[PDB]
Amino acid sequence: KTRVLVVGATGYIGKRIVRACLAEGHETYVLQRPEIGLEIEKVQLFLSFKKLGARIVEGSFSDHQSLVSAVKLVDVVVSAMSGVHFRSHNILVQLKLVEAIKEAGNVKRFLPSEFGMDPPRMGHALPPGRETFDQKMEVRQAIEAAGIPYTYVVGACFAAYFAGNLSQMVTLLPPKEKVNIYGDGNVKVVFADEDDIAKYTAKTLNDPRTLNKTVNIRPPDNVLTQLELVQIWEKLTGKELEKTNIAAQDFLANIEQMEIPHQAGIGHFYHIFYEGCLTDHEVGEDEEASSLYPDVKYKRMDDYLRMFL
Amino acid sequence: KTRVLVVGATGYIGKRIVRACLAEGHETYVLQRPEIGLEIEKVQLFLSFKKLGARIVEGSFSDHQSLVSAVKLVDVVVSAMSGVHFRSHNILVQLKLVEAIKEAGNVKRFLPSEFGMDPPRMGHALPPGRETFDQKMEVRQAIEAAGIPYTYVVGACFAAYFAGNLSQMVTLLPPKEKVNIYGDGNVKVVFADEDDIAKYTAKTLNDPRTLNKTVNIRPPDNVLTQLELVQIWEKLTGKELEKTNIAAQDFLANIEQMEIPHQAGIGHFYHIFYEGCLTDHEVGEDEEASSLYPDVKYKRMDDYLRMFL
Ligand SMILES: NC(=O)C1=CN([C@@H]2O[C@H](COP(=O)(O)OP(=O)(O)OC[C@H]3O[C@@H](n4cnc5c(N)ncnc54)[C@H](OP(=O)(O)O)[C@@H]3O)[C@@H](O)[C@H]2O)C=CC1
Ligand SMILES: NC(=O)C1=CN([C@@H]2O[C@H](COP(=O)(O)OP(=O)(O)OC[C@H]3O[C@@H](n4cnc5c(N)ncnc54)[C@H](OP(=O)(O)O)[C@@H]3O)[C@@H](O)[C@H]2O)C=CC1
Ligand SMILES: COc1cc(C[C@@H](CO)[C@H](CO)Cc2ccc(O)c(OC)c2)ccc1O
Ligand SMILES: COc1cc(C[C@@H](CO)[C@H](CO)Cc2ccc(O)c(OC)c2)ccc1O
Fold first, then answer.
1. In this structure, are A199 and A246 located in the same domain?
2. Atom of ligand 4 nearest to the CA of B85
3. Which of A218, B13, B113, B216 could form a disulfide bond with B283, CB atoms 3.0-4.6 angstroms apart?
């Protein structure tokens, strides 16, 4: 039975990872930091984790030995550290965790906070959005310099942020009458339900086939253009939306005058929806999660959109 | 089937009330405001309410006619509007809801955001903590000046904020070694698990016995002094905490130099734990929730504190 520590256990994807590790059968440990003692929602999330069988490990990123003590308890460490300018962007805090893992010596595998665009492919990304990928690469460099075995989980847009809203970044809900189509809307994007991402993560973290590999989440039925996604919604509702196409030059106009977190998100969106960075390269079945774990009946985007009806 | 609209449905007590209403069998509507369309945890709470059978109603407090249209759908309105300086004290925003209910004309009963100390009894409370009770009284005055039938739910500390921390304000968890005892710690306080508060609310909102009444949540086994609460924890852990008694004047010293939210919390804590405002008066069985609704097997504080072990 694999012992797993989740760092970032109350995060958006982190809490789903915790639940998936428990459902998968791992002996699941969660890092409870003292710094969140007055955040009721985080405190009660940890209580709900206990009720499911998780074990609470106290530790703080400002207490190096507490980190060393925590990772000594487990076989596998999964980090779900924050990495969005709109929420918080603390990817480099994981360097402290890498050091602790190096000192401890017992960790068979480390999964850093990846779960998105594939950082080594983003060398030409727009600033400031490119900071996300630069920092994740710095964490990759530290892992590999330390000889820590790893799995990098990448490649799919979170469904809540990109599918549930028909990729309109101004809201998280489907639009009522009008929709913006980015470019011709014929660039393929990868969408995945975050619960499937979590389940794939829990299955891969002790899979010999993905040791020291990048694992892509590219479920075939969820590789869709934005227009195909919109058309699903039109069919489910029986109502055509009024579409306005946004050319690339207009999408990026006056970016320098927007707030940093919005510039970052605009830049990421551009790489995904105008440059097709999630589909602009092939990946083999031995490095794709839905082929690797075919017992995961992943949620397709029509069933995902059905929850908004 | 009573039709209920919950306003403040993603709130701390509000989400619990939505679930208690659904479990009770009410036809449960929830106000989804457009202003929270970019708050992922709220959006997904609404998705979770839909899955349980709640009906989504769209409206905004800046759109008076949307409020009128929303309350026209239901028999009963429950408001769980925020009311804590540390988390956004917006009690008076409810006046716009009262005005919409007045215009709509069909609402059989309104429960405003009470759920705490009994505001008419707090006329001598310390500033700025008295603002909570002053603003709730203004809402009561507007309800009654509009002729809207009402039920006011009062009288119990939320267990997460006052029991699970042994009433230490700096945290939401029991202390490891030391505990402050406020005064002699022999002043009776009322504690209630918030799921129970939500269940009593769901049961009372269509109870002819509580039309135009104040309903007290005062479960007899949960009327405890702070020392009794601490002794419950000591019995569960097997170990005694080192106790330091804090005299009233030392608790209040230099209150004027604290940030305003902390000043409010100190003042509220003072009335409860030093003046005994939740237990310094008696209430009848026909106005107390545990007698009115004996089938609610309310959680006692030993069972509550066990989830922290
Ligand atoms: N479309 C996609 O593919 C998406 C990809 N992502 C990526 O997923 C990963 C996780 O992102 P997300 O779920 O939104 O993260 P969150 O913003 O939910 O934060 C995750 C956790 O990071 C911890 N955290 C934040 N700051 C600190 C700090 N200074 N010190 C210690 N811990 C801290 C907290 O852990 P704790 O629980 O202990 O409090 C927090 O819960 C990132 O790499 C992100 O880039 C995210 C959104 C979209
Ligand atoms: N020990 C006790 O007895 C306690 C008593 N209370 C009392 O409980 C009641 C609810 O408190 P609590 O659950 O902490 O509230 P929250 O802080 O969780 O907020 C509740 C809801 O208020 C809505 N809200 C906040 N600001 C606005 C605004 N400008 N306009 C419209 N809606 C707004 C939101 O509704 P939405 O869901 O639509 O976004 C929010 O979810 C209060 O009266 C409080 O005093 C609370 C703490 C302890
Ligand atoms: C696919 O890979 C990634 C994707 C992301 C998405 C981030 C980008 O900043 C944010 C949300 O956190 C998306 C977002 C931005 C603005 C919006 O108005 C918006 O509306 C819902 C959604 C981050 C990291 C990744 O590796
Ligand atoms: C019993 O009646 C009420 C009680 C309350 C509790 C409020 C008071 O501000 C807050 C939480 O929201 C309590 C709190 C304050 C500071 C803290 O450090 C703290 O540690 C957990 C807890 C509000 C309204 C009421 O009518």
1. no
2. 9
3. B216
User: B158 a known binding residue?
Assistant: yes
Task: Tell me whether A171 touches chain B (CB under 8 Å).
Answer: yes
A12, A84, A88, A158: which to mutate for ligand 3, most atoms within 8 A of CB? A84
How far is the centre of ligand 4, averaged over its atoms, from the C-alpha of B161 (Å)? 6
SS3 B61: coil
Count of pairs with CB atoms under 8 A, one residue in A, one in B: 41
Q: Are B111 and B1 in a shared domain? A: yes
Distance CA B226, CA A37 (A): 21
Looking from the CA of residue A168, the nearest atom of ligand 3 is: 20
Distance from CA of B145 to the nearest CA of A (A): 36
Task: Give A16 to chain B, closest Cα distance, Å.
Answer: 13
Catalytic site includes residue B96 = no
Q: Domain check: are B206 and B76 in the same one?
A: yes
Amino acid at A76: V
Residues B96 and B120 in one domain: yes
The whole domain housing A64 covers: 1-154+194-216+282-293
Same domain, A250 and A199: no
Query: In 10 A of CB B50, how many CB atoms?
Result: 16
| Number of structural domains in chain A | 2
Structural method: X-ray
Burial A73-111 (b: 16+ CB within 10 A, else e): ebbbbbbbbbbbbeeebebbbbbebbebbbebeebebbb
* Resolution to 1 decimal place, in Å: 2.0
B22 and B126 in a single domain? The answer is yes
